[PDB]
């Protein structure tokens, strides 16, 4: 957490969110938790809400020690959209672009994230 490997790892994840996932066109509705004022039934239907701001807060708190836990929350954003909006909703297509560019960027950074993950895991000993 305070160690530089965790901080460097969190920094890379935050940059994927801000530079790539939040840059997806029309992605604003995913940037923050759903507003109940405009979507009144949302929290009755979706039991485990997730959004990009919540992911960034988790990164800031160093919640993620590897990409598997990060991806679990990223994929939950899409899972909720399929359930709430439907599999062919414009909003679900946006969520899929967000998820897709996240995976693509992780791949571009693989060798580097792999090293940080290994060292973070090593230090947990």
Numbering used by the authors: 1520 to 1644
Question: Which lines from the publication concern this structure?
Answer:
Bromodomains (BRDs) are protein interaction modules that specifically recognize ε-N-lysine acetylation motifs, a key event in the reading process of epigenetic marks. Despite large sequence variations, all BRD modules share a conserved fold that comprises a left-handed bundle of four α helices (αZ, αA, αB, αC), linked by loop regions of variable length (ZA and BC loops), which line the Kac binding site and determine binding specificity.
Insertions x6 are present in the C-terminal BRDs of TAF1 and TAF1L and possibly PRKCBP1.
